Amino acid sequence: MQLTADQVEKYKSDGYVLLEGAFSPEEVHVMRQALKKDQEVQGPHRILEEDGRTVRALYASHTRQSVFDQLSRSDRLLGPATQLLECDLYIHQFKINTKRAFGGDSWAWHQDFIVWRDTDGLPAPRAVNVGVFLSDVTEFNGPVVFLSGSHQRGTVERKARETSRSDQHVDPDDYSMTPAELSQMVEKHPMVSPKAASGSVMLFHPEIIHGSAPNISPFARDLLIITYNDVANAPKPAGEPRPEYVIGRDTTPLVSRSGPLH
Amino acid sequence: GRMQLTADQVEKYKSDGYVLLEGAFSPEEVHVMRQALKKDQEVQGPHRILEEDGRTVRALYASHTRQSVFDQLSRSDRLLGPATQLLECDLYIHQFKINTKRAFGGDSWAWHQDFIVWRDTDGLPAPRAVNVGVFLSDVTEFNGPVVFLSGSHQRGTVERKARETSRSDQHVDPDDYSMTPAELSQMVEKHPMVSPKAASGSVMLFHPEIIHGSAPNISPFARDLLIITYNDVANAPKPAGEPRPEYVIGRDTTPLVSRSGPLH
Ligand SMILES: O=C(O)CCC(=O)C(=O)O
Ligand SMILES: O=C(O)CCC(=O)C(=O)O
Ligand SMILES: CC(C)C[C@H](N)C(=O)O
Ligand SMILES: CC(C)C[C@H](N)C(=O)O
Ligand SMILES: [Co+2]
Ligand SMILES: [Co+2]
Ligand code: NA
């Protein structure tokens, strides 16, 4: 499981690459059933929307549901991630952002790396985000939007907002881009939203500027994201580290697994 | 009969409930309309609706009564030719609004049909009207375009009662008549979501019973959407109570005469 040379160049130049149809419909069935089961588990890893009606984000489902553990070790994910980072990898973060039909809320414009750098002592952006679509992603159900190529700017420096939106994780709003920055950046780094059927995979750079809008549609948008990190790039927090459900601590190199998810 | 829709365009309107005419107005004409909009946004009065956060204008009514170029627009054969063709009658302005959905958080518009609001609020007898959208901004997937449930006007009016309380006392916000999640879930299989997208100066005609709505605009680009509702002169509202203000519901049923030529 490998990227084509064009796909590697696309990731380098644009900051994201889309692999359609990586997981088959029956594997999507098994994953969605495990998502529905996992959403019922109470705990601090389960983040509700502000309006309280539905789950907004779930952390560390791979520690509770076997299929998500299998997914996280799949060579269909680790092959591409290893090709891009050229190192041994471990799971820095595992989340599913479950954006409900009929009002699932937005995700603020941000970069990921600065959050992990400043909150957790992540030294360098030697990591890759690997999205797995558990819903068809369309123009209508709040797809991730990227500022194309904006990871080439590196980290856009800022201080965290005075008050945190959530005490269960860092909501990107805490490190949100300002309007002035977005207006300047979008002219050089235009908006693009990769669209594809469920089971598709989207790899994207931790310094790409990205965000997503509220989902007004009748269709849910369940988006799984695994952040793989270089084992030699473990966080060095100055204080007590955040919980393991949000920030991984086991830097044992992952060994990939071939075959279907079951 | 100058500005005539083709058979294909009429068929699209009849079957799908909307049709997009790209590039109807030039960049120069769009610029004049955008300058008029910036001026009109500053006019104080009840025709000016603010977003819930008060930070920007959400909607303006009756700009054609204050800005010459919007009066010219409302009489242009590029809008009245198609409207007259679709309705086959003399027309007057039922409603004139500009929904100015600002960059960086301009708010959504609830899923709804237009006709039932006018039927129940104003005594509009029948859906013998057409909505004419004019794009004063480029409309993309990113700046909260109108989304239609394609073909849903063929269901006629989906009956409901207005919400006990109104969101606004300056106009009827569509949320007062919003579609239920159950309705939308059931209907979208047969009437899928579609969003006309096009450069500023394009025109979008749509039926007053099509289900439609729009999302918040998280992008750095504004989305200024002008909508003129033309009504059959024989289909004037017959209100049972005191009529709403003229800035929101037109009363002068004198047939409009279309004009050719550039806006200035
Ligand atoms: O789920 C989304 O739309 C994006 C959220 C995101 O960027 C993140 O959680 O880092
Ligand atoms: O501006 C929009 O997105 C649509 C609002 C609408 O449908 C209306 O005002 O009737
Ligand atoms: C910007 C996001 C990737 C941050 C994430 N929610 C965290 O708490 O680590
Ligand atoms: C549904 C909308 C077309 C109603 C409009 N805002 C009015 O007050 O008439
Ligand atoms: Co992010
Ligand atoms: Co409407
Ligand atoms: Na004209």
Author numbering:
A (entry chain A): 1 to 262
B (entry chain B): -1 to 262
Excerpt from the paper describing this PDB structure:
Like LdoA and EcdK, GriE belongs to the 2OG-Fe(ii) oxygenase superfamily, whose members couple the decarboxylation of α-ketoglutarate to substrate oxygenation/hydroxylation via an oxo-ferryl intermediate. Recombinant GriH purified from S. lividans TK24 lacked the characteristic fluorescence of the expected F420 co-factor but nevertheless led to 4-MePro in a coupled assay with GriF, indicating that GriH can use NADH directly without requiring F420. Together, these experiments suggest that 4-MePro biosynthesis starts with the GriE-mediated hydroxylation of l-leucine, followed by oxidation with GriF. The crystal structures of the leucine hydroxylase GriE have been determined in complex with substrates and products, providing insight into the stereospecificity of the reaction.
The canonical iron-binding motif is formed by His110, Asp112 and His210 and has lost the metal in the apo structure. The crystal structure obtained by co-crystallization with Co2+ and substrates unambiguously revealed bound metal and both l-leucine and α-ketoglutarate. Co2+ is coordinated by the iron-binding motif and by α-ketoglutarate as a bi-dentate ligand through its C-1 carboxylate and C-2 keto group (6A and S9†). The axial position trans to His110, the expected binding site of oxygen, remains vacant. l-Leucine does not coordinate to the metal ion but is tightly bound via its carboxy and amino groups. Its side chain is not involved in the interactions and adopts a conformation that corresponds to the most probable rotamer. The coordination site trans to His110 remains vacant. This crystal structure should thus correspond to the substrate complex prior to the binding of dioxygen to the unoccupied coordination site of Fe(ii). In the GriE/substrate complex, both the Cδ methyl groups of l-leucine are located at a 4.4 Å distance to the metal. The reactive oxygen atom should be coordinated to the metal in a distance of approx. 1.6 Å.19–21 With respect to this position, the pro-S group would be closer to the reactive oxygen atom (3.0 Å) than the other Cδ methyl group (3.3 Å), explaining the exclusive formation of (2S,4R)-5-hydroxyleucine.
